[PDB]
Design a protein around this ligand. Structure first.
Ligand SMILES: [Cl-]
Lengths: 327, 327
């Protein structure tokens, strides 16, 4: 038996509840993990919110990111003592995740760590992984430094911040767009050449093709922002669409695509194929490592997690929270 | 002096006029081509249509595709006797194009033919080139035969017919969507596994995420058709958008992108960089040669062109018209 921090719904509200629990509580899987570290994401905070729309059904241990050490394995790909990261698929949303001393997952959902420490794996986590996919996607369509600035929208969120870091470190001129002026310095510290406010700017008349400004973009916002970005991408550029704030509707035109050769590349880390996921983590370990992430990382003891979750939900938390569970 | 077929605007009508002209009438450029073949596209019909929206100003020699022999060159890259194809940029829309015995173009807009004949290069033309671009775009995002059908919308048009041919020949299972049931046989002859009508079908409810039926698509329609296609692409699939039939507006959602990892890739043959254009014509000569295009190709003497333009404008023309400018 071990300690798990279980989310439970009673009379409409949702509460994180520290409880001792046995083996039979864990979901089904070939690989059991002593969870060293986890993270706090907006998605983890939504799992502890009434109408959050993230959890299929309670009760559930939240924590979409799981990083730690294999204690038991019924799979020949993983040995005891291997360090691993597991994220995406059902983890922390439809089955028990990282906010517990132990977790169990299929081997088909597990990534083996090499150089990278478990703490770093968790610090990067789903958010940084998604940023890395966005960078690969853009590069997969010919985007290279020195044909203009790369825009990152919703830049202060978890994906945006790592994107700025990765793109700047790969030699792109990054312009970060954020609706939170208090975050401009942090974004600059992460490599933004400039920081601007929300898009479109209030005065702007929307056109099918507006003034070409951006060589590429990483979009974390969707809606009218994305529609505006598409109208202002340069000939042959691309946009990696990673996120949604507001409704899902997108009202655009086909003109940037057919007249400007623009590409819109949808980024999904949840169901990304495991072979590719493992490959990408290797990059995260090496050439795609976020160099300046540590400088905004803060260690949060699992016991103090509700405090951070609340600030993340309120949108007032600064930096990246890596949750110390069992280290 | 030589013969040109010139489109002139007269009291609201647009007619093609066979006229004797001299060198000074040719536009500026390093390469002079004795035109052997051109083609009829819907775009060329529109050039010869009152509110067609394709021609910058009249008078103009229409014909977006030019294939023939270099007879003069101020450029070291082209020699007298070289066979070439020239299409895109301003050709046949903002400067004199292929419906004339000679044409002149910058060297940077010219593709030198090796194996390929000028007849073949005209028969493929812009429409076939655009089909080949669409196939490359899909493959650039991982699309492969064997894990579901590929949709081709507006399939009976110039781009769609060549896309059916190329995709079926590469092993894909191609479903051809066509609003013209009389064309089903021709589409089957070019390799369509199945032929269906227009999309969406009247009895389908439009959703953000509809039934995942298509591994990928080549869309030549845009509008509500493209919105529907985007909502019905399977996880990780892609769409190559080349066309606009209706309005340019596109009302969609970000959900196929964000939740299903779908890509939308805009296809522009008009301004595509010459270096890439030249490489892709090498492929059309070899690994991407449309194997069944000759079976639907028809030679049309330049003198009889108006008859074919009128049928193409009406949507009543069967197959591909290659125009023999020079005897
Ligand atoms: Cl933001």
């Amino acid at each position: 038996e071990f300690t798990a921090w279980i989310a439970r719904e009673n009379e409409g509200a949702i509460g994180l509840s520290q409880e001792t629990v046995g083996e039979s509580f864990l979901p089904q899987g070939e690989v059991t993990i002593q969870v060293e570290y986890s993270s706090v994401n907006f998605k983890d905070a939504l799992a502890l919110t009434p109408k959050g729309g993230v959890v299929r059904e309670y009760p559930i241990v939240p924590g979409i990111d799981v990083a730690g050490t294999v204690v038991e394995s019924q799979s020949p790909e993983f040995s005891v003592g291997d360090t691993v990261v597991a994220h995406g698929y059902d983890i922390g949303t439809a089955r028990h995740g990282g906010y517990a001393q132990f977790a169990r997952v299929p081997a088909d959902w597990v990534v083996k760590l090499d150089g990278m420490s478990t703490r770093t794996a968790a610090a990067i986590g789903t958010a940084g992984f998604t940023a890395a996919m966005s960078v690969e996607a853009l590069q997969s369509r010919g985007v290279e430094p020195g044909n203009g600035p790369v825009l990152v929208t919703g830049a202060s969120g978890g994906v945006g911040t790592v994107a700025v870091d990765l793109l700047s470190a790969a030699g792109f001129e990054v312009v970060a767009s954020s609706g939170k002026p208090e975050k401009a310095e942090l974004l600059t510290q992460l490599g933004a050449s400039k920081v601007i406010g929300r898009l479109p700017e209030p005065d702007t008349k929307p056109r099918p093709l507006g003034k070409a400004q951006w060589a590429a973009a990483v979009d974390c916002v969707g809606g009218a922002t994305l529609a505006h970005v598409l109208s202002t991408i340069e000939y042959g550029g691309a946009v990696a669409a990673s996120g949604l704030t507001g409704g899902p509707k997108l009202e655009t035109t086909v003109l940037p695509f057919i007249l400007r050769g623009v590409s819109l590349l949808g980024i999904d880390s949840v169901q990304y194929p495991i072979d590719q996921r493992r490959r990408l983590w290797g990059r995260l370990a090496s050439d795609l490592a976020p160099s300046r992430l540590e400088s905004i990382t803060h260690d949060v003891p699992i016991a103090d997690v509700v405090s951070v979750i609340d600030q993340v939900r309120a949108g007032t938390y600064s930096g990246r929270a890596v949750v110390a569970v069992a280290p």
